Ligand binder design. Structure first.
Ligand code: HEM
Length: 291
């Protein structure tokens, strides 16, 4: 398929900055969610899940179509718990009905990251809602109970290299696993609603113990009360992965830069931007605007 970005008719930067501010103010306000973690983390997960269905082989899936809006994709077992990010954005969509779904879903991710003190993520508008028949079949999102080979192989479908895989996974610093959703339980660290390189430090510095949880799945448990999925853990089992983990554990800046690039790339996979298309926008945070 060819997916050409098409700017929402007559909208500019300022229009988008308003959508951004709307999400950000709601993030600030609905702070009681998930025991006071807030919605930030679920939004980031939602932006990754709508983008992660992409197949570099036939150009299907990815964020373009806003297909998560369809039952098929919405009811993907792997998307369990995302309905919360969805209901968070609805009221927003209602307020700015001209924005396409794909644009909204992906912007929430950017907004969440930036408002949780992460790096600035350049964003591009132009995703166009596609018909329900362009909805990708379930089973394109990765399993958690695998090793580094699985991960490398998987990520290759999305065109991501080692560096990109490790950068993107540092997103695990945010939120936590929910038994009910995924069959895994516990956060990855302490500051789970602030974007930092905590993930890498926990990985390197905790004394991880393999145990089975109440869903009868194996997870790495630390005495600090943290957990790591087998897929997380595999970042230290693979030699190529481990040196990158180390780099990030050592330099939060480097990690921020790598994440930034990788995240935008993830969100733009499968989209063709005509040369006349506007440059990537860099939204200001509420704080930068004095709001
Ligand atoms: C091997 C690849 C990955 C696997 C197997 C994986 C698996 C999971 C699982 C099982 C959960 C818990 C869901 C729940 O029970 O609520 C989760 C949560 C999360 N995922 Fe990952 N993930 C992967 C990659 C990513 C990437 C690339 C990102 C973004 C860059 C990401 C962002 C998140 C966030 C922010 C959460 C926490 C959400 C919350 O607190 O509701 N994950 N992931």
């Amino acid at each position: 398929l060819v997916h050409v970005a098409s700017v929402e008719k007559g909208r500019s930067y300022e229009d988008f900055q308003k959508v951004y501010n709307a999400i950000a103010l709601k993030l600030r306000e609905d702070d009681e969610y998930d025991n006071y973690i807030g919605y930030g983390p679920v939004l980031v997960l939602l932006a990754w899940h709508i983008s992660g269905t992409w197949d570099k082989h036939d150009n299907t899936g990815g964020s373009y179509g806003g297909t998560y809006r369809f039952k098929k994709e919405f009811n993907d077992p792997s998307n369990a718990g995302l309905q919360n990010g969805f209901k968070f954005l609805e009221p927003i969509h209602k307020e700015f009905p001209w924005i396409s779904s794909g644009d909204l879903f992906s912007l929430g991710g950017v907004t969440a990251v930036q408002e949780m003190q992460g790096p600035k993520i350049p964003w591009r508008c132009g995703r166009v809602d596609t018909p329900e028949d362009t909805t990708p079949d379930n089973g394109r999102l990765p399993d958690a109970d695998k090793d580094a080979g699985y991960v490398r192989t998987f990520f290759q479908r999305l065109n991501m290299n080692d560096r990109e895989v490790v950068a993107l996974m540092g997103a695990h610093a945010l939120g936590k696993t929910h038994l009910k959703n995924s069959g895994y339980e516990g956060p990855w660290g302490a500051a789970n609603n602030v974007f930092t390189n905590e993930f890498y430090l926990n990985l390197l510095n905790e004394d991880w113990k393999l145990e089975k949880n109440d869903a009868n799945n194996e997870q790495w448990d630390s005495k600090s009360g943290y957990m790591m999925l087998p897929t997380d853990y595999s970042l230290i089992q693979d030699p190529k992965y481990l040196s990158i983990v180390k780099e990030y554990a050592n330099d939060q800046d480097k990690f921020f830069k790598d994440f930034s690039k990788a995240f935008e790339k993830l969100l733009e996979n499968g989209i063709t931007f005509p040369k006349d298309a506007p440059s990537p926008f860099i939204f200001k945070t509420l704080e930068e605007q004095g709001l």
